Write a protein that binds this ligand. Structure first.
Ligand SMILES: CCN1C(=O)c2cccc3c(S(=O)(=O)NC4CCCCC4)ccc1c23
Length: 131
């Protein structure tokens, strides 16, 4: 088809675990209802709300470089489906999302500023987690 590499996309990350028993917790609830909701509405959130489309965003080699993709849409779905055992698993996924941005992009890029601002807010919000 193409004369320059355009890339391709993996299926989005899994968002449910059919073997996992349900275990609801206060911190997981707070993560879904307060932390993620606050992050989602931040002015710089939109690029992180859905999986990277390597083809449409013209980032052909994105999924060569990023072996563990992550986005806020996926994190939201994982919280909704009770995929996470604890807050730390969720936090790890946020960390994977931000660090993927830092890995793929150059330190001076606009997208990295946006990720850094979101990460700073995230770190503030996780200090609110209930006992
Ligand atoms: C967060 C996922 N993500 C990237 O890592 C990335 C790199 C380059 C552009 C871009 C875009 S984009 O909509 O093509 N371009 C810009 C639009 C607003 C300034 C920062 C990036 C969306 C999501 C991205 C990227």
């Amino acid at each position: 088809h193409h004369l320059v590499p355009r890339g391709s996309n993996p299926p989005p990350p899994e968002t449910s675990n059919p073997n996992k028993p349900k275990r609801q917790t206060n911190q997981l609830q707070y993560l879904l209802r307060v932390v993620l909701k606050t992050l989602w509405k931040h002015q710089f959130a939109w690029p992180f709300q859905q999986p990277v489309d390597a083809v449409k965003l013209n980032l052909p080699d994105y999924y060569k470089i990023i072996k563990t993709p992550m986005d806020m849409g996926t994190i939201k779905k994982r919280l909704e489906n009770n995929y996470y055992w604890n807050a730390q698993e969720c936090i790890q996924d946020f960390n994977t999302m931000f660090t993927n941005c830092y890995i793929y992009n150059k330190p001076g890029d606009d997208i990295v500023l946006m990720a850094e601002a979101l990460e700073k807010l995230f770190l503030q919000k996780i200090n609110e987690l209930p006992t």
